[PDB]
Amino acid sequence: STASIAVEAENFNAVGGTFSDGQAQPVSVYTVNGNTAINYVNQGDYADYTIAVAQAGNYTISYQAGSGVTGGSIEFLVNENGSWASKTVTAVPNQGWDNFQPLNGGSVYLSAGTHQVRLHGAGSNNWQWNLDKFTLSN
């Protein structure tokens, strides 16, 4: 029942958000030290991903995330029949914008099938976090 699904944060299907950050898109892509990541993530911004899951299970979520402020949090949601369902919310340690560190994001039950997942800038700060990737492990 072991399984591992790595998702590159830059590989979102769509991004969204109201915060006026002056960029072409509400969330942007950059590279640092060979790591391609999303940045300019503000409060209320989000990134959507479509994920195929062959093996049903209670997956553990790990993020390769950094932040340069206090009050950034990653909320992981799944779109369940046209309504977003909040799964976990994880504060991101303030250890530097480009300093990605493994971050435990809790667990989420995923059935065998295809899931729309959203990562949302849920924290209190105007500025939230940068993200290299996340992994779902069973």
Ligand X SMILES: OC[C@H]1O[C@@H](O)[C@H](O)[C@H](O[C@@H]2O[C@H]3CO[C@@H]([C@@H]2O)[C@@H]3O[C@@H]2O[C@H](CO)[C@H](O)[C@H](O[C@@H]3O[C@H]4CO[C@@H]([C@@H]3O)[C@@H]4O[C@@H]3O[C@H](CO)[C@H](O)[C@H](O[C@@H]4O[C@H]5CO[C@@H]([C@@H]4O)[C@@H]5O)[C@H]3O)[C@H]2O)[C@H]1O
Instruction: Point out the annotated binding site for Ca(2+).
Output: 8, 10, 21, 26, 36, 40, 42, 45, 132
Q: Among 15, 120, 130, 133, which residue sits at the site for ligand X (rule: CB under 6 A)?
A: 130
Which lies closer to Ca ion via its Cβ, residue 118 or residue 133? 133
Between CA 93 and CA 101 the distance in angstroms is 9
CB 76 within 8 A of CB 88: yes
Residue in the structure block whose two tokens are 């062959």: 54
Q: Is 97 in the site for ligand X (CB under 6 A)?
A: yes
Alpha carbons within 13 A on the beta-carbon side of 38: 31
Q: Is 43 in the site for Ca ion (CB under 5 A)?
A: no
- Cβ 30 to Ca ion, closest distance in Å? 10
CA-atom Rg of the chain in angstroms: 14
Which lies closer to ligand X via its Cβ, residue 40 or residue 63? 40
Q: Is 98 in the site for Ca ion (CB under 5 A)?
A: no
Q: Among 12, 59, 127, 134, which residue sits at the site for ligand X (rule: CB under 6 A)?
A: 127
Alpha carbons within 13 A on the beta-carbon side of 33: 5
Q: In this structure, how many other beta carbons lie within 10 angstroms of the beta carbon of residue 48?
A: 16
79 binds, among Ca ion, ligand X, Cl ion, none (CB under 5 to 8 A by kind): none
SS3 10: helix
Binding site for ligand X (CB under 6 A): 39-40, 68-69, 97, 127, 130
